[PDB]
Enzyme design. Structure first.
Site, PDB file in Angstrom:
ATOM      1  N   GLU A 289       0.798  -1.219   0.000  1.00 47.02           N
ATOM      2  CA  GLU A 289       0.000   0.000   0.000  1.00 47.02           C
ATOM      3  C   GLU A 289       0.833   1.272   0.000  1.00 47.02           C
ATOM      4  O   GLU A 289       0.261   2.368   0.065  1.00 47.02           O
ATOM      5  CB  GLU A 289      -0.952   0.009   1.202  1.00 47.02           C
TER       6      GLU A 289
ATOM      7  N   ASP B 171      -5.717   9.380  -2.807  1.00 43.89           N
ATOM      8  CA  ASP B 171      -5.698   8.034  -3.359  1.00 43.89           C
ATOM      9  C   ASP B 171      -6.520   7.985  -4.646  1.00 43.89           C
ATOM     10  O   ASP B 171      -6.987   9.009  -5.155  1.00 43.89           O
ATOM     11  CB  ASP B 171      -6.206   7.032  -2.325  1.00 43.89           C
TER      12      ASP B 171
END
Ligand code: L6T
Ligand code: L6T
Ligand code: L6T
Ligand code: L6T
Ligand code: L6T
Ligand code: FG0
Ligand code: MHA
Ligand code: MHA
Length: 900
Positions: A731, A740
């Site tokens: 991640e 994101d």
């Protein structure tokens, strides 16, 4: 101070470029084999003396001034057929014509033939002694052209086939050159005996180690490529330094076995890595990073045990050391290059071909750890008794006795000495050189002769002291420089040589004269003292370098000091048995060899070889035991675990090299028999008595101080990979606020701050979460803190879910991290969707679980992360993360963003 970053890099790069690796390396070694089948035409027989010794200087000055002695090149015993006498003039004419014929055809090889048969009506008593008194035998001497040993031997081999037919084939050839060519042809005979009896036996031993055709065939191909490339390397070395004949079988007797053993170990662990669930890329990399470095360390140890032989001046030992080093290093390189790439290409196909293609150690170790002294002492005593024969020991030079007692050439040499005694002599020589340059006057010769006559023990056949120490014969190839004069005389008993020379050296020369003591006994004694003088430094270098390398490997001080003396014991008892065999003679009748003293360089060679063998085996074994004690295991279960997983492979490799060594112990050259028998003995002692009985007891009585790690000379254990690193991979780790793939303000490891569009609201919540005002940036440790909080939230959510708590309690910590990873990505309901796979995981059915997980939509959408997590489930290790391709580019926040 390790560096497995290099081995990790190479394990990756050899998989990446496997095709050009196999291509280039196979090409180079096969080319080297083509290049080095010509090695037999560029080897030498010289190398047994100390070419810096006084006797060698004496020999060189003698051959320069007077001319090298060619009278011993070839003696030929002719005896007339039909019991006729040697005075028959018809047979005389026939044989004289045959010999002049063979000399007429080969004048660039033969100087001519000497003997009574040339002038049968003569006064010369020495020449008339060239016929027996029953007049049914007579010998001639056939000197050959050439100015080094190798050239003269080549000329002899050129003219021998026609020389042998003289006198209806009933002519017996002896002398230096028939014996030399027999002794050097034993090499090729040994190589063929190897080719025919060893490779089928080692092939079936390979197939009994792996019940599979391809897995068994790979190490054999590695050994063949090793032999080829090493012969090429040795042919290349031969163009700078002389390489002895004996270097050729050493490539086969030591090189091939070790290359095959390296291949054994690497294929073995590649197969076991594949069985543990890794894919062939990770399998190759781990095989390198473990067994490849074990074999590299093995090569370093063997080189460290052979290099001290370079201390000796005999070119023999030099070339043998070179051959060992080339064979061993090429074996290691091949085993982690050609073999690694071959496995990378093959994969699980290594086991595709069964035998159908045709067209317990732990009981044993535990039996003996509660009874240690019941085996320890009644083994050490037997081994010291095996060393007491070593005190019986003598050394000598090459003789015709080095051939078997029924060898035709040896027998005709012995019949020549029987029929014509007193011709074969080995005089000591006083060679005098005038420093300044003038001729040497007869007064000086008389002075030196008197000072030679003060010393006892020199033969006086005519019982006239004045006529001993005659002048050496001077022939047409001597410069006859008057500033150099040689006198010489044989010994009555050659056992006094060592002292007689020493007293003739103790003589003081005439004014202005330098005198060198030479002659065959002088050469041999000088070479023996060479070896004995530089042997202690050899042994010390050997021992202490081996023990510092075992410091590096074991990480202990008591374990290397123990293994050193255990190997000293193995070496001592092996040499004691060898002396009982070859000096005292036990085994000489069955094997067909003559009991006699040993070649002196063979002592240093056998010390190096056997020592290297024993410490190689001991490191290979007790390595896994030190790894067992490093992996939390106890001492006891550590000795057991070490002997267990090693036993089969140790005995397999031991058996393969034992097979080829037993192929070699049948050689006609007794030096070969000695060395190959030493190999077999040290092998069978290292593979069973010490390996099974001595080490576990001796290391049990050393209870827990078996590993004493003083100071900072021990491996601390490094950062254990953790869930933080795993999801930093999966991640990302961003220390500044970002958006994101959903436009949401995220930070750290996928930590959602807020779904609001205000960056300032995100800054507010991040300031609240971290405890300071951040302006949108945090440190690495704060990101780790946020990640730990999120992990705690995810675990709490997991333990709260009836579909996930059982499988989660089932799992180990690494697989627990894999499950937390899955939860982070897709939510607990998403993870609970995988009912069957979760049950499989719960039942530790890792294989089927991985198979089923890969069939999911999760895998199809994000194959790299899903594949890493699935691999973590399969193997239960961090391998898929500890080594992986760079980084990720799509960042998405995870479930269980924890706020406070
Ligand atoms: C692979 C295992 C097989 C082993 C094969 C061993 C075969 C044994 C053959 C022995 C041949 C001895 O030949 C006799 C020769 O001895 C000396 O010279 C030799 O000693 C010097 C030291 O350096 C050199 O300089 C000379 O060149 C060199 O001929 C003498 O000066 C020569 O007058 C004499 O002729
Ligand atoms: C381990 C290997 C062991 C091998 C043992 C070696 C065997 C040694 C055999 C050597 C035979 C030497 O004998 C041959 C003779 O050569 C020289 O004469 C030469 O000049 C004369 C002119 O006046 C002529 O008459 C002679 O024919 C001519 O040869 C010497 O002056 C003689 O004293 C010697 O007798
Ligand atoms: C992997 C291989 C490792 C080898 C381990 C070390 C063992 C090497 C072989 C040692 C001797 C083998 O025995 C071979 C010899 O047996 C007998 O002699 C032996 O029994 C006689 C009884 O009367 C005594 O007189 C003799 O002294 C005695 O040597 C025969 O007379 C010989 O024909 C034959 O050569
Ligand atoms: C121009 C080209 C020049 C090429 C230069 C090549 C230089 C050759 C030296 C290469 C360094 C390799 O050295 C080996 C290193 O590994 C050892 O442990 C390894 O062997 C153990 C056996 O017990 C296993 O148990 C462990 O898993 C395993 O790490 C030790 O930890 C280190 O002390 C040692 O140094
Ligand atoms: C623990 C596993 C160990 C496995 C070791 C077995 C693997 C390799 C074994 C190969 C055996 C090949 O055959 C053995 C040898 O038989 C005879 O030898 C001769 O030897 C003496 C020399 O004079 C005399 O007795 C006779 O001339 C004669 O018997 C042949 O003449 C040789 O050509 C042949 O080489
Ligand atoms: C890495 C190493 C090993 C592996 S994997 C498998 C088992 O065999 C070893 C290799 C062979 N070695 C024995 C040996 C044989 C001949 C030698 C010698 C040592 O040293 C000096 C010259 O001749 C013992 C350990
Ligand atoms: N990974 C899975 O469990 C997929 N499962 C889903 C389920 O357990 O209901 C379907 C299957 O086993 O074919
Ligand atoms: N390689 C990527 O960045 C895209 N993916 C990774 C993958 O496809 O496995 C997103 C993720 O890490 O979850």
């Amino acid at each position: 101070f390790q560096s497995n970053a290099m081995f990790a890099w190479w394990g990756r790069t050899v998989y990446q470029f496997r095709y050009i690796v196999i291509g280039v390396m196979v090409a180079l070694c096969l080319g080297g084999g083509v290049y080095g089948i010509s090695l037999g035409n560029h080897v030498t027989q010289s190398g047994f003396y100390d070419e810096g010794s006084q006797s060698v200087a004496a020999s060189l000055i003698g051959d320069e001034v007077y001319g090298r002695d060619r009278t011993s090149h070839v003696v030929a015993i002719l005896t007339p057929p039909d019991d006729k006498k040697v005075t028959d003039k018809a047979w005389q004419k026939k044989v004289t014509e045959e010999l002049d014929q063979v000399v007429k055809d080969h004048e660039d090889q033969i100087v001519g033939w000497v003997g009574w048969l040339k002038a049968p009506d003569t006064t010369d008593p020495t020449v008339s002694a060239m016929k027996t008194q029953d007049l049914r035998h007579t010998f001639i001497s056939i000197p050959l052209q050439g100015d080094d040993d190798d050239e003269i031997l080549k000329n002899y081999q050129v003219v021998e086939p026609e020389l042998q037919q003289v006198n209806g084939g009933d002519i017996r050839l002896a002398g230096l050159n028939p014996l030399a060519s027999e002794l050097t042809g034993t090499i090729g005979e040994d190589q063929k005996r190897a080719e025919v009896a060893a490779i089928p036996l080692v092939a079936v031993v390979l197939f009994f180690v792996f019940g599979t055709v391809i897995a068994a065939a790979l190490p054999a191909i590695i050994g063949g490529l090793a032999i080829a490339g090493a012969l090429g390397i040795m042919r290349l070395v031969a163009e700078f330094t002389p390489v002895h004949f004996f270097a050729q079988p050493v490539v086969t007797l030591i090189g091939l076995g070790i290359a095959i053993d390296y291949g054994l170990f690497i294929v073995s662990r590649f197969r076991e890595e594949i069985a543990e669930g890794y894919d062939t890329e990770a399998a190759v990399r781990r095989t390198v990073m473990t067994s490849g470095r074990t074999v590299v360390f093995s090569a370093v140890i063997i080189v460290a045990s052979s290099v001290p032989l370079l201390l000796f001046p005999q070119g023999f030992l030099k070339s043998i050391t070179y051959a060992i080093i080339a064979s061993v290093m090429l074996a290691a390189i091949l085993s982690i290059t050609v073999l690694a790439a071959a496995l990378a290409i093959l994969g699980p196909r290594v086991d595709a071909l069964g035998v159908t293609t045709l067209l317990f150690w732990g009981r044993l170790v535990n039996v003996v750890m509660k009874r240690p002294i019941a085996f320890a002492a009644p083994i050490l005593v037997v081994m010291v008794l095996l060393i007491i024969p070593l005190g019986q020991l003598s050394l000598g030079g090459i003789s015709e006795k080095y051939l078997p007692p029924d060898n035709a050439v040896r027998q005709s040499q012995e019949q020549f000495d029987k029929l014509f005694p007193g011709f074969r002599t080995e005089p000591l020589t006083l060679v005098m050189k005038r420093e300044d340059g003038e001729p040497i006057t007869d007064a000086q010769i008389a002075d030196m002769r008197a000072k030679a006559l003060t010393v006892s023990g020199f033969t006086d056949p005519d019982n006239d002291p004045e006529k001993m120490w005659k002048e050496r014969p001077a022939n047409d190839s001597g410069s006859k420089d008057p500033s150099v004069r040689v006198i010489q005389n044989g010994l009555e008993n050659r056992n006094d040589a060592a002292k007689k020379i020493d007293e003739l050296r103790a003589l003081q020369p005439p004014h202005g004269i330098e005198v060198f003591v030479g002659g065959t006994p002088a050469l041999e004694q000088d070479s023996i003292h060479s070896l004995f003088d530089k042997l202690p430094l050899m042994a010390l270098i050997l021992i202490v370098t081996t023990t510092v390398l075992m410091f590096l490997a074991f990480g202990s001080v008591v374990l290397p000091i123990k293994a050193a003396l255990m190997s000293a014991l193995t070496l001592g008892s092996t040499m004691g048995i060898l002396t009982w065999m070859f000096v005292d003679g036990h085994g000489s009748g069955l094997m067909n060899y003559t009991p006699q003293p040993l070649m002196a360089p063979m002592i240093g060679l056998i010390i190096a070889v056997i020592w290297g063998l024993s410490t190689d085996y001991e490191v290979f074994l007790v390595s896994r035991m030190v790894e067992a004690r490093e992996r939390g295991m106890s001492t006891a279960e550590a000795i057991r675990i070490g002997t267990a997983t090693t036993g089969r492979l140790i005995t397999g490799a031991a058996l393969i090299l034992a097979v080829v060594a037993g192929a070699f112990v049948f050689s006609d050259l007794v030096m070969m028999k000695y060395l190959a028998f030493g190999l077999l003995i040290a092998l069978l002692l290292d593979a069973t008595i010490i390996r099974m009985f001595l080490v576990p007891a001796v290391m049990k009585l050393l209870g827990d101080d078996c590993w004493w790690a003083p100071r900072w000379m021990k491996r601390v254990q490094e950062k254990e990979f953790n869930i933080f690193e795993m999801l930093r991979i999966d991640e990302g780790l961003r220390l500044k606020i970002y958006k994101d793939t959903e436009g949401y303000y995220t930070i750290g490891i996928g930590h959602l701050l807020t779904k609001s569009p205000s960056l300032n609201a995100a800054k507010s919540e991040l300031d609240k979460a971290i405890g300071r005002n951040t302006n949108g940036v945090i440190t690495k440790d704060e990101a780790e803190k946020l990640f730990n909080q999120d992990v705690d939230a995810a675990v709490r959510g997991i333990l709260r879910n009836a579909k996930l708590k059982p499988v989660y309690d089932s799992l180990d910590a690494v697989r627990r991290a894999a499950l937390i990873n899955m939860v982070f990505q897709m939510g607990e309901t998403g993870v609970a969707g995988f009912t069957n796979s979760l049950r499989m995981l719960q039942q530790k059915r890792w294989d089927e679980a991985a198979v089923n997980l890969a069939k999911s939509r999760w895998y199809n959408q994000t194959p790299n992360r899903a594949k890493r997590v699935i691999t973590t489930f399969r193997t239960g290790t961090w391998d898929a993360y500890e080594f992986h391709l760079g980084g990720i580019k799509a960042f998405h926040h995870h479930h269980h963003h924890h706020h406070h």
